[PDB]
Scaffold this active site. Structure first.
Site, PDB file in Angstrom:
ATOM      1  N   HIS A  78      48.026  26.063  50.480  1.00  0.00           N
ATOM      2  CA  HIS A  78      48.339  26.126  51.763  1.00  0.00           C
ATOM      3  C   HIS A  78      49.643  25.432  52.349  1.00  0.00           C
ATOM      4  O   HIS A  78      50.289  24.649  52.911  1.00  0.00           O
ATOM      5  CB  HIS A  78      47.332  25.004  52.586  1.00  0.00           C
ATOM      6  CG  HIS A  78      45.711  25.672  52.675  1.00  0.00           C
ATOM      7  ND1 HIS A  78      44.862  24.975  51.965  1.00  0.00           N
ATOM      8  CD2 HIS A  78      45.736  26.512  53.222  1.00  0.00           C
ATOM      9  CE1 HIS A  78      43.669  25.590  52.151  1.00  0.00           C
ATOM     10  NE2 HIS A  78      44.155  26.793  52.884  1.00  0.00           N
ATOM     11  N   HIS A  82      51.218  31.362  51.303  1.00  0.00           N
ATOM     12  CA  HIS A  82      49.904  31.602  51.850  1.00  0.00           C
ATOM     13  C   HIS A  82      50.031  31.907  53.301  1.00  0.00           C
ATOM     14  O   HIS A  82      49.478  33.137  53.854  1.00  0.00           O
ATOM     15  CB  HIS A  82      48.946  30.386  51.905  1.00  0.00           C
ATOM     16  CG  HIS A  82      47.718  30.750  52.891  1.00  0.00           C
ATOM     17  ND1 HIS A  82      46.856  31.389  52.616  1.00  0.00           N
ATOM     18  CD2 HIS A  82      47.119  29.967  53.879  1.00  0.00           C
ATOM     19  CE1 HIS A  82      45.760  31.541  53.568  1.00  0.00           C
ATOM     20  NE2 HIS A  82      45.687  30.700  54.307  1.00  0.00           N
ATOM     21  N   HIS A 118      49.064  29.697  61.472  1.00  0.00           N
ATOM     22  CA  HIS A 118      47.788  29.071  61.314  1.00  0.00           C
ATOM     23  C   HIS A 118      47.357  27.896  60.470  1.00  0.00           C
ATOM     24  O   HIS A 118      46.416  27.299  60.463  1.00  0.00           O
ATOM     25  CB  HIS A 118      46.783  30.360  60.929  1.00  0.00           C
ATOM     26  CG  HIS A 118      46.586  30.480  59.757  1.00  0.00           C
ATOM     27  ND1 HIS A 118      47.387  31.127  58.894  1.00  0.00           N
ATOM     28  CD2 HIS A 118      45.536  29.851  58.863  1.00  0.00           C
ATOM     29  CE1 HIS A 118      47.094  31.018  57.502  1.00  0.00           C
ATOM     30  NE2 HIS A 118      45.869  30.439  57.509  1.00  0.00           N
ATOM     31  N   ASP A 119      48.219  27.630  59.534  1.00  0.00           N
ATOM     32  CA  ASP A 119      48.364  26.363  58.407  1.00  0.00           C
ATOM     33  C   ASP A 119      49.394  25.412  58.473  1.00  0.00           C
ATOM     34  O   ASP A 119      49.348  24.605  57.612  1.00  0.00           O
ATOM     35  CB  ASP A 119      47.872  27.078  57.215  1.00  0.00           C
ATOM     36  CG  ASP A 119      46.304  27.226  56.916  1.00  0.00           C
ATOM     37  OD1 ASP A 119      45.384  26.679  57.612  1.00  0.00           O
ATOM     38  OD2 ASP A 119      45.889  28.000  55.676  1.00  0.00           O
ATOM     39  N   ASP A 236      42.684  35.518  56.346  1.00  0.00           N
ATOM     40  CA  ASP A 236      42.620  34.190  55.806  1.00  0.00           C
ATOM     41  C   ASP A 236      41.826  34.487  54.454  1.00  0.00           C
ATOM     42  O   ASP A 236      41.956  33.676  53.572  1.00  0.00           O
ATOM     43  CB  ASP A 236      42.158  33.284  56.678  1.00  0.00           C
ATOM     44  CG  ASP A 236      42.657  31.835  56.643  1.00  0.00           C
ATOM     45  OD1 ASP A 236      43.491  31.645  55.868  1.00  0.00           O
ATOM     46  OD2 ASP A 236      42.158  31.124  56.965  1.00  0.00           O
ATOM     47  N   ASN A 239      42.101  36.917  50.050  1.00  0.00           N
ATOM     48  CA  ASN A 239      42.602  36.881  48.516  1.00  0.00           C
ATOM     49  C   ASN A 239      41.616  37.607  47.521  1.00  0.00           C
ATOM     50  O   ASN A 239      42.201  38.299  46.372  1.00  0.00           O
ATOM     51  CB  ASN A 239      42.585  35.361  48.053  1.00  0.00           C
ATOM     52  CG  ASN A 239      43.575  34.355  48.582  1.00  0.00           C
ATOM     53  OD1 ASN A 239      44.412  35.009  49.437  1.00  0.00           O
ATOM     54  ND2 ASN A 239      43.401  33.338  48.827  1.00  0.00           N
ATOM     55  N   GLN A 287      34.255  31.301  42.228  1.00  0.00           N
ATOM     56  CA  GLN A 287      34.595  32.560  42.917  1.00  0.00           C
ATOM     57  C   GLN A 287      33.567  33.379  43.084  1.00  0.00           C
ATOM     58  O   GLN A 287      33.680  34.203  44.210  1.00  0.00           O
ATOM     59  CB  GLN A 287      35.790  33.374  42.147  1.00  0.00           C
ATOM     60  CG  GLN A 287      37.322  32.357  42.060  1.00  0.00           C
ATOM     61  CD  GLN A 287      37.724  32.272  43.464  1.00  0.00           C
ATOM     62  OE1 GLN A 287      37.813  33.330  44.101  1.00  0.00           O
ATOM     63  NE2 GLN A 287      37.862  31.117  43.988  1.00  0.00           N
ATOM     64  N   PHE A 290      31.856  32.221  46.126  1.00  0.00           N
ATOM     65  CA  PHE A 290      32.750  32.318  47.279  1.00  0.00           C
ATOM     66  C   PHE A 290      32.410  33.767  47.704  1.00  0.00           C
ATOM     67  O   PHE A 290      32.289  34.046  48.986  1.00  0.00           O
ATOM     68  CB  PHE A 290      34.048  32.018  46.781  1.00  0.00           C
ATOM     69  CG  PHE A 290      35.375  32.186  47.909  1.00  0.00           C
ATOM     70  CD1 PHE A 290      35.095  31.568  49.160  1.00  0.00           C
ATOM     71  CD2 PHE A 290      36.302  32.863  47.827  1.00  0.00           C
ATOM     72  CE1 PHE A 290      35.902  31.662  50.226  1.00  0.00           C
ATOM     73  CE2 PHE A 290      37.362  32.930  48.749  1.00  0.00           C
ATOM     74  CZ  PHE A 290      37.054  32.347  50.026  1.00  0.00           C
TER      75      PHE A 290
HETATM   76  C1  E8H Z   1      41.086  32.481  46.574  1.00  0.00           C
HETATM   77  O1  E8H Z   1      39.991  31.383  46.489  1.00  0.00           O
HETATM   78  C2  E8H Z   1      39.692  30.580  47.607  1.00  0.00           C
HETATM   79  C3  E8H Z   1      40.558  30.648  48.602  1.00  0.00           C
HETATM   80  C4  E8H Z   1      40.034  30.043  49.720  1.00  0.00           C
HETATM   81  C5  E8H Z   1      39.069  29.255  49.795  1.00  0.00           C
HETATM   82  C6  E8H Z   1      38.846  28.284  51.032  1.00  0.00           C
HETATM   83  N1  E8H Z   1      37.677  27.550  51.053  1.00  0.00           N
HETATM   84  N2  E8H Z   1      37.198  26.901  52.125  1.00  0.00           N
HETATM   85  C7  E8H Z   1      35.511  26.318  51.988  1.00  0.00           C
HETATM   86  C8  E8H Z   1      35.601  25.646  51.105  1.00  0.00           C
HETATM   87  C9  E8H Z   1      34.219  25.389  50.893  1.00  0.00           C
HETATM   88  N3  E8H Z   1      33.240  26.224  50.908  1.00  0.00           N
HETATM   89  C10 E8H Z   1      32.082  26.490  50.114  1.00  0.00           C
HETATM   90  O2  E8H Z   1      32.039  26.139  49.049  1.00  0.00           O
HETATM   91  C11 E8H Z   1      31.193  27.760  50.338  1.00  0.00           C
HETATM   92  N4  E8H Z   1      30.427  28.327  49.367  1.00  0.00           N
HETATM   93  C12 E8H Z   1      29.058  28.011  49.477  1.00  0.00           C
HETATM   94  O3  E8H Z   1      28.345  27.442  50.125  1.00  0.00           O
HETATM   95  C13 E8H Z   1      28.680  28.704  48.033  1.00  0.00           C
HETATM   96  C14 E8H Z   1      29.801  28.945  47.206  1.00  0.00           C
HETATM   97  C15 E8H Z   1      30.797  28.835  48.243  1.00  0.00           C
HETATM   98  O4  E8H Z   1      32.067  29.136  47.964  1.00  0.00           O
HETATM   99  C16 E8H Z   1      33.391  27.228  52.396  1.00  0.00           C
HETATM  100  C17 E8H Z   1      34.829  27.747  52.153  1.00  0.00           C
HETATM  101  C18 E8H Z   1      38.073  26.697  53.087  1.00  0.00           C
HETATM  102  O5  E8H Z   1      37.719  26.102  54.210  1.00  0.00           O
HETATM  103  C19 E8H Z   1      39.438  27.130  52.770  1.00  0.00           C
HETATM  104  C20 E8H Z   1      40.403  26.982  54.344  1.00  0.00           C
HETATM  105  C21 E8H Z   1      40.197  28.045  54.964  1.00  0.00           C
HETATM  106  C22 E8H Z   1      39.800  29.309  54.565  1.00  0.00           C
HETATM  107  C23 E8H Z   1      39.171  29.371  53.221  1.00  0.00           C
HETATM  108  C24 E8H Z   1      39.622  28.549  52.164  1.00  0.00           C
HETATM  109  C25 E8H Z   1      38.312  29.005  48.499  1.00  0.00           C
HETATM  110  C26 E8H Z   1      38.588  29.849  47.613  1.00  0.00           C
HETATM  111  O6  E8H Z   1      37.795  29.754  46.295  1.00  0.00           O
HETATM  112  C27 E8H Z   1      36.393  29.220  46.411  1.00  0.00           C
HETATM  113 MG    MG Z   2      43.624  26.657  58.014  1.00  0.00          MG
HETATM  114 ZN    ZN Z   3      44.889  29.891  55.857  1.00  0.00          ZN
END
Ligand code: E8H
Ligand code: MG
Ligand code: ZN
EC number: 3.1.4.53
Length: 329
Positions: A78, A82, A118-119, A236, A239, A287, A290
Protein backbone atom coordinates in the site's frame (compact mmCIF):
# COMPACT_ATOMS: atom_id res chain seq x y z
CA UNK A 1 14.73 22.31 -23.01
CA UNK A 2 15.63 18.76 -24.15
CA UNK A 3 15.16 15.74 -21.82
CA UNK A 4 17.95 13.95 -19.95
CA UNK A 5 18.57 10.36 -21.13
CA UNK A 6 16.81 8.93 -18.05
CA UNK A 7 13.78 11.25 -18.68
CA UNK A 8 13.73 9.96 -22.29
CA UNK A 9 13.76 6.34 -21.24
CA UNK A 10 10.91 7.20 -18.74
CA UNK A 11 9.00 8.91 -21.57
CA UNK A 12 9.27 5.86 -23.76
CA UNK A 13 7.93 3.50 -20.99
CA UNK A 14 5.03 5.97 -20.46
CA UNK A 15 4.00 5.47 -24.09
CA UNK A 16 2.36 2.29 -22.71
CA UNK A 17 0.12 4.28 -20.27
CA UNK A 18 -3.03 3.27 -22.23
CA UNK A 19 -2.21 -0.44 -21.96
CA UNK A 20 -3.12 -3.12 -19.49
CA UNK A 21 0.22 -4.31 -18.07
CA UNK A 22 2.27 -1.15 -18.11
CA UNK A 23 5.68 -1.70 -16.60
CA UNK A 24 4.81 0.17 -13.47
CA UNK A 25 7.74 -0.94 -11.40
CA UNK A 26 10.15 0.16 -14.14
CA UNK A 27 8.34 3.54 -14.22
CA UNK A 28 8.82 3.80 -10.44
CA UNK A 29 12.58 3.21 -10.82
CA UNK A 30 13.03 5.48 -13.83
CA UNK A 31 11.08 8.39 -12.23
CA UNK A 32 13.11 8.30 -9.01
CA UNK A 33 10.17 6.79 -7.07
CA UNK A 34 7.61 9.18 -8.57
CA UNK A 35 5.35 6.78 -10.47
CA UNK A 36 2.19 8.38 -9.12
CA UNK A 37 3.20 11.89 -10.11
CA UNK A 38 4.39 10.95 -13.57
CA UNK A 39 1.53 8.66 -14.38
CA UNK A 40 -1.07 11.15 -13.09
CA UNK A 41 0.55 14.02 -15.02
CA UNK A 42 0.60 11.90 -18.17
CA UNK A 43 -3.05 10.94 -17.80
CA UNK A 44 -4.20 14.50 -17.03
CA UNK A 45 -2.35 15.82 -20.15
CA UNK A 46 -3.73 12.92 -22.34
CA UNK A 47 -7.36 13.49 -21.19
CA UNK A 48 -6.92 17.28 -21.43
CA UNK A 49 -7.94 17.74 -17.80
CA UNK A 50 -5.68 20.71 -17.11
CA UNK A 51 -7.37 22.78 -19.76
CA UNK A 52 -10.87 21.53 -19.03
CA UNK A 53 -10.58 22.26 -15.31
CA UNK A 54 -8.22 25.24 -15.61
CA UNK A 55 -5.69 23.46 -13.38
CA UNK A 56 -2.39 25.38 -13.29
CA UNK A 57 0.38 22.94 -14.13
CA UNK A 58 2.73 23.91 -11.24
CA UNK A 59 -0.21 23.44 -8.83
CA UNK A 60 -0.91 19.96 -10.28
CA UNK A 61 2.70 18.89 -9.95
CA UNK A 62 2.96 20.35 -6.42
CA UNK A 63 -0.14 18.52 -5.24
CA UNK A 64 0.87 15.27 -6.88
CA UNK A 65 4.35 15.30 -5.31
CA UNK A 66 2.74 16.13 -1.97
CA UNK A 67 0.19 13.32 -2.39
CA UNK A 68 2.84 10.83 -3.43
CA UNK A 69 4.96 11.86 -0.48
CA UNK A 70 2.11 10.95 1.91
CA UNK A 71 2.15 7.38 0.71
CA UNK A 72 4.51 5.36 2.94
CA UNK A 73 7.68 4.09 1.27
CA UNK A 74 8.21 1.65 4.16
CA UNK A 75 4.93 -0.17 3.44
CA UNK A 76 5.43 -3.04 0.96
CA UNK A 77 2.15 -3.00 -0.89
CA UNK A 78 0.00 0.00 0.00
CA UNK A 79 2.46 2.55 -1.29
CA UNK A 80 2.74 5.03 -4.14
CA UNK A 81 3.37 2.30 -6.71
CA UNK A 82 0.08 0.63 -5.89
CA UNK A 83 -1.65 4.06 -6.13
CA UNK A 84 -0.02 4.58 -9.48
CA UNK A 85 -1.15 1.18 -10.69
CA UNK A 86 -4.72 1.76 -9.58
CA UNK A 87 -4.79 5.12 -11.30
CA UNK A 88 -3.42 3.69 -14.53
CA UNK A 89 -5.74 0.69 -14.42
CA UNK A 90 -8.73 3.03 -13.90
CA UNK A 91 -7.56 5.09 -16.78
CA UNK A 92 -7.62 1.98 -19.03
CA UNK A 93 -11.04 0.83 -17.76
CA UNK A 94 -12.49 4.27 -18.41
CA UNK A 95 -11.50 3.99 -22.08
CA UNK A 96 -13.31 0.68 -22.59
CA UNK A 97 -15.42 0.80 -25.83
CA UNK A 98 -18.63 -0.06 -23.99
CA UNK A 99 -18.28 3.09 -21.96
CA UNK A 100 -17.37 5.42 -24.86
CA UNK A 101 -18.87 8.85 -24.30
CA UNK A 102 -20.80 7.68 -21.25
CA UNK A 103 -19.07 9.73 -18.52
CA UNK A 104 -18.59 13.46 -18.17
CA UNK A 105 -15.19 15.06 -17.76
CA UNK A 106 -16.06 15.67 -14.05
CA UNK A 107 -16.87 12.00 -13.53
CA UNK A 108 -13.63 11.02 -15.19
CA UNK A 109 -11.70 13.48 -12.96
CA UNK A 110 -13.51 12.03 -9.95
CA UNK A 111 -12.57 8.38 -10.81
CA UNK A 112 -8.94 9.27 -11.52
CA UNK A 113 -8.45 11.55 -8.46
CA UNK A 114 -10.23 8.99 -6.27
CA UNK A 115 -7.84 6.31 -7.58
CA UNK A 116 -4.84 8.51 -6.84
CA UNK A 117 -5.80 9.21 -3.21
CA UNK A 118 -7.59 5.97 -2.42
CA UNK A 119 -4.85 4.48 -0.13
CA UNK A 120 -2.92 7.59 0.92
CA UNK A 121 -1.13 7.42 4.36
CA UNK A 122 -1.90 3.69 4.61
CA UNK A 123 0.01 2.31 7.66
CA UNK A 124 0.21 -1.24 6.16
CA UNK A 125 -2.26 -2.87 8.60
CA UNK A 126 -5.95 -3.67 8.22
CA UNK A 127 -9.02 -1.98 9.57
CA UNK A 128 -9.55 -4.83 12.03
CA UNK A 129 -5.96 -4.50 13.30
CA UNK A 130 -6.49 -0.77 13.87
CA UNK A 131 -9.81 -1.36 15.69
CA UNK A 132 -8.34 -4.21 17.86
CA UNK A 133 -5.29 -2.14 18.84
CA UNK A 134 -7.41 0.82 19.93
CA UNK A 135 -5.48 2.90 17.39
CA UNK A 136 -6.09 6.60 17.13
CA UNK A 137 -7.45 6.16 13.59
CA UNK A 138 -10.02 3.66 14.66
CA UNK A 139 -11.18 5.96 17.40
CA UNK A 140 -11.37 8.92 15.13
CA UNK A 141 -13.61 7.14 12.65
CA UNK A 142 -15.75 5.43 15.25
CA UNK A 143 -14.43 2.14 13.83
CA UNK A 144 -16.29 2.51 10.48
CA UNK A 145 -14.17 2.17 7.18
CA UNK A 146 -11.37 3.55 9.23
CA UNK A 147 -8.60 3.44 6.60
CA UNK A 148 -10.88 4.59 3.75
CA UNK A 149 -12.20 7.52 5.71
CA UNK A 150 -8.62 8.48 6.54
CA UNK A 151 -7.39 8.17 2.86
CA UNK A 152 -10.21 10.59 1.92
CA UNK A 153 -9.50 13.08 4.69
CA UNK A 154 -5.78 13.19 3.86
CA UNK A 155 -6.35 13.34 0.11
CA UNK A 156 -8.59 16.37 0.53
CA UNK A 157 -6.56 18.06 3.27
CA UNK A 158 -3.45 18.05 1.14
CA UNK A 159 -5.24 20.43 -1.21
CA UNK A 160 -4.74 23.06 1.46
CA UNK A 161 -0.94 23.00 1.33
CA UNK A 162 1.01 25.69 -0.42
CA UNK A 163 0.08 25.82 -4.10
CA UNK A 164 -1.75 22.47 -3.90
CA UNK A 165 -5.37 23.38 -4.67
CA UNK A 166 -5.84 21.73 -8.01
CA UNK A 167 -9.59 22.46 -7.88
CA UNK A 168 -9.19 26.20 -7.25
CA UNK A 169 -10.94 27.10 -10.56
CA UNK A 170 -13.90 24.76 -10.29
CA UNK A 171 -17.28 26.27 -9.44
CA UNK A 172 -18.80 25.42 -6.12
CA UNK A 173 -21.28 23.17 -7.95
CA UNK A 174 -18.49 21.35 -9.64
CA UNK A 175 -16.61 20.93 -6.38
CA UNK A 176 -19.53 19.66 -4.43
CA UNK A 177 -20.32 17.16 -7.20
CA UNK A 178 -16.67 16.08 -7.49
CA UNK A 179 -16.28 15.72 -3.72
CA UNK A 180 -19.35 13.57 -3.32
CA UNK A 181 -18.33 11.25 -6.18
CA UNK A 182 -14.79 10.93 -4.81
CA UNK A 183 -16.03 10.05 -1.34
CA UNK A 184 -18.53 7.54 -2.73
CA UNK A 185 -15.79 5.91 -4.79
CA UNK A 186 -13.11 5.66 -2.08
CA UNK A 187 -15.50 4.41 0.55
CA UNK A 188 -16.48 1.56 -1.86
CA UNK A 189 -12.85 0.33 -1.82
CA UNK A 190 -13.35 -1.07 1.69
CA UNK A 191 -13.60 -4.84 1.18
CA UNK A 192 -16.46 -5.02 3.67
CA UNK A 193 -18.48 -3.42 0.86
CA UNK A 194 -17.46 -5.87 -1.85
CA UNK A 195 -20.41 -8.36 -1.59
CA UNK A 196 -23.03 -5.62 -1.82
CA UNK A 197 -21.28 -3.81 -4.65
CA UNK A 198 -20.95 -7.05 -6.58
CA UNK A 199 -24.61 -7.94 -5.92
CA UNK A 200 -25.57 -4.51 -7.34
CA UNK A 201 -23.36 -4.80 -10.31
CA UNK A 202 -24.92 -8.25 -11.14
CA UNK A 203 -28.41 -6.67 -10.90
CA UNK A 204 -27.33 -3.97 -13.31
CA UNK A 205 -25.96 -6.51 -15.78
CA UNK A 206 -29.33 -8.41 -15.53
CA UNK A 207 -31.35 -5.24 -16.32
CA UNK A 208 -28.76 -3.58 -18.59
CA UNK A 209 -29.81 -1.20 -21.38
CA UNK A 210 -27.64 0.04 -24.21
CA UNK A 211 -27.91 2.85 -26.69
CA UNK A 212 -27.93 0.53 -29.70
CA UNK A 213 -24.25 1.02 -30.31
CA UNK A 214 -23.25 -1.45 -27.70
CA UNK A 215 -22.72 1.42 -25.30
CA UNK A 216 -24.25 1.48 -21.78
CA UNK A 217 -27.12 3.77 -20.76
CA UNK A 218 -26.72 5.16 -17.25
CA UNK A 219 -29.40 7.75 -16.62
CA UNK A 220 -29.37 8.33 -12.86
CA UNK A 221 -26.65 9.01 -10.29
CA UNK A 222 -27.14 5.63 -8.52
CA UNK A 223 -26.24 3.76 -11.61
CA UNK A 224 -23.49 6.09 -12.85
CA UNK A 225 -21.76 6.08 -9.39
CA UNK A 226 -22.16 2.35 -9.04
CA UNK A 227 -20.30 1.76 -12.32
CA UNK A 228 -17.54 4.16 -11.20
CA UNK A 229 -17.31 2.53 -7.79
CA UNK A 230 -17.09 -0.93 -9.28
CA UNK A 231 -14.57 0.28 -11.90
CA UNK A 232 -12.15 1.63 -9.30
CA UNK A 233 -12.79 -1.45 -7.11
CA UNK A 234 -11.83 -3.64 -10.24
CA UNK A 235 -8.69 -1.54 -10.59
CA UNK A 236 -7.92 -2.03 -6.97
CA UNK A 237 -8.41 -5.79 -7.47
CA UNK A 238 -6.63 -5.94 -10.78
CA UNK A 239 -3.33 -7.52 -9.73
CA UNK A 240 -4.26 -11.06 -10.77
CA UNK A 241 -5.43 -9.89 -14.16
CA UNK A 242 -2.02 -8.52 -15.07
CA UNK A 243 0.77 -10.49 -16.79
CA UNK A 244 2.39 -12.92 -14.42
CA UNK A 245 5.62 -11.02 -13.97
CA UNK A 246 3.67 -8.08 -12.59
CA UNK A 247 1.20 -10.17 -10.60
CA UNK A 248 3.96 -12.00 -8.68
CA UNK A 249 5.57 -8.83 -7.64
CA UNK A 250 2.26 -7.67 -6.27
CA UNK A 251 1.79 -11.00 -4.52
CA UNK A 252 5.24 -10.72 -2.89
CA UNK A 253 4.36 -7.31 -1.63
CA UNK A 254 0.97 -8.14 -0.25
CA UNK A 255 2.42 -11.16 1.52
CA UNK A 256 5.24 -9.08 3.03
CA UNK A 257 2.71 -6.60 4.34
CA UNK A 258 0.33 -9.26 5.60
CA UNK A 259 3.19 -11.29 7.15
CA UNK A 260 4.40 -8.13 8.97
CA UNK A 261 0.98 -7.51 10.35
CA UNK A 262 0.93 -11.21 11.26
CA UNK A 263 4.23 -10.77 13.16
CA UNK A 264 2.70 -7.86 15.21
CA UNK A 265 -0.49 -9.93 15.81
CA UNK A 266 1.47 -12.99 17.06
CA UNK A 267 3.69 -10.88 19.43
CA UNK A 268 0.61 -9.40 21.26
CA UNK A 269 -1.28 -12.73 21.54
CA UNK A 270 -3.84 -11.57 18.96
CA UNK A 271 -5.92 -13.86 16.76
CA UNK A 272 -3.68 -13.98 13.59
CA UNK A 273 -5.57 -12.78 10.48
CA UNK A 274 -6.17 -14.68 7.24
CA UNK A 275 -3.01 -15.23 5.11
CA UNK A 276 -0.98 -13.28 7.69
CA UNK A 277 0.75 -16.22 9.49
CA UNK A 278 4.14 -16.73 7.69
CA UNK A 279 4.34 -20.25 9.18
CA UNK A 280 0.74 -21.59 8.54
CA UNK A 281 -0.23 -19.76 5.22
CA UNK A 282 0.52 -21.12 1.70
CA UNK A 283 0.94 -18.27 -0.82
CA UNK A 284 -0.27 -20.21 -3.83
CA UNK A 285 -3.52 -21.48 -2.16
CA UNK A 286 -4.19 -18.03 -0.80
CA UNK A 287 -3.99 -16.61 -4.34
CA UNK A 288 -6.20 -19.31 -5.73
CA UNK A 289 -8.71 -18.51 -2.99
CA UNK A 290 -8.47 -14.78 -3.63
CA UNK A 291 -9.19 -15.33 -7.29
CA UNK A 292 -12.00 -17.89 -6.88
CA UNK A 293 -13.89 -16.10 -4.13
CA UNK A 294 -13.29 -12.38 -4.86
CA UNK A 295 -11.41 -11.48 -8.02
CA UNK A 296 -12.96 -13.83 -10.63
CA UNK A 297 -16.57 -13.25 -9.60
CA UNK A 298 -16.00 -9.46 -9.80
CA UNK A 299 -14.15 -9.48 -13.08
CA UNK A 300 -16.53 -11.95 -14.67
CA UNK A 301 -19.40 -9.65 -13.84
CA UNK A 302 -17.49 -6.59 -15.05
CA UNK A 303 -16.67 -8.52 -18.32
CA UNK A 304 -20.46 -9.17 -18.70
CA UNK A 305 -21.23 -5.50 -18.26
CA UNK A 306 -18.72 -4.45 -20.96
CA UNK A 307 -18.86 -7.62 -23.15
CA UNK A 308 -16.72 -8.32 -25.09
CA UNK A 309 -14.18 -5.65 -24.08
CA UNK A 310 -12.71 -7.37 -20.95
CA UNK A 311 -12.17 -10.88 -22.53
CA UNK A 312 -8.37 -10.74 -22.71
CA UNK A 313 -8.22 -9.54 -19.12
CA UNK A 314 -10.48 -12.33 -17.88
CA UNK A 315 -8.36 -14.84 -19.93
CA UNK A 316 -5.19 -13.61 -18.25
CA UNK A 317 -6.84 -13.96 -14.86
CA UNK A 318 -7.89 -17.54 -15.66
CA UNK A 319 -4.39 -18.40 -16.93
CA UNK A 320 -2.83 -16.97 -13.78
CA UNK A 321 -5.37 -18.82 -11.70
CA UNK A 322 -4.25 -22.13 -13.41
CA UNK A 323 -0.56 -21.20 -13.01
CA UNK A 324 -0.95 -20.62 -9.28
CA UNK A 325 -3.13 -23.78 -8.92
CA UNK A 326 -0.48 -25.93 -10.75
CA UNK A 327 2.24 -24.84 -8.30
CA UNK A 328 0.46 -26.18 -5.19
CA UNK A 329 2.43 -29.15 -3.68
C1 E8H B 1 -2.20 -9.69 -5.12
O1 E8H B 1 -2.70 -10.31 -3.95
C2 E8H B 1 -3.57 -9.60 -3.18
C3 E8H B 1 -3.85 -8.26 -3.35
C4 E8H B 1 -4.74 -7.63 -2.51
C5 E8H B 1 -5.38 -8.31 -1.49
C6 E8H B 1 -6.36 -7.62 -0.62
N1 E8H B 1 -7.01 -8.35 0.21
N2 E8H B 1 -7.83 -7.77 1.07
C7 E8H B 1 -8.76 -8.68 1.78
C8 E8H B 1 -8.02 -9.54 2.79
C9 E8H B 1 -8.92 -10.61 3.40
N3 E8H B 1 -9.69 -11.32 2.38
C10 E8H B 1 -9.77 -12.66 2.20
O2 E8H B 1 -8.96 -13.41 2.70
C11 E8H B 1 -10.91 -13.20 1.35
N4 E8H B 1 -10.78 -14.61 0.98
C12 E8H B 1 -11.69 -15.59 1.34
O3 E8H B 1 -12.67 -15.40 2.03
C13 E8H B 1 -11.22 -16.90 0.76
C14 E8H B 1 -9.81 -16.62 0.31
C15 E8H B 1 -9.72 -15.13 0.27
O4 E8H B 1 -8.86 -14.45 -0.26
C16 E8H B 1 -10.46 -10.44 1.52
C17 E8H B 1 -9.51 -9.52 0.79
C18 E8H B 1 -7.87 -6.44 1.31
O5 E8H B 1 -8.70 -5.96 2.04
C19 E8H B 1 -6.85 -5.59 0.64
C20 E8H B 1 -7.25 -4.11 0.66
C21 E8H B 1 -8.15 -3.74 -0.45
C22 E8H B 1 -8.35 -4.50 -1.50
C23 E8H B 1 -7.77 -5.86 -1.65
C24 E8H B 1 -6.59 -6.14 -0.77
C25 E8H B 1 -5.10 -9.65 -1.31
C26 E8H B 1 -4.20 -10.30 -2.13
O6 E8H B 1 -3.90 -11.62 -2.01
C27 E8H B 1 -4.74 -12.42 -1.19
MG1 MG C 1 -7.61 0.63 0.48
ZN1 ZN D 1 -5.78 -0.07 -2.87
Amino acid sequence: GVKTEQEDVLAKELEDVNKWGLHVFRIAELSGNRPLTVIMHTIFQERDLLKTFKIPVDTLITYLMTLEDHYHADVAYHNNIHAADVVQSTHVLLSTPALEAVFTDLEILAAIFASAIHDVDHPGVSNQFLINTNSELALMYNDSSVLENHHLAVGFKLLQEENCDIFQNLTKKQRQSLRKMVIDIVLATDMSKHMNLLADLKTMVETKKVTSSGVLLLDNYSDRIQVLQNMVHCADLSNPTKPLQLYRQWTDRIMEEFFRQGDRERERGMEISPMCDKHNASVEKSQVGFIDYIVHPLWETWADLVHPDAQDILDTLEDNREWYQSTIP
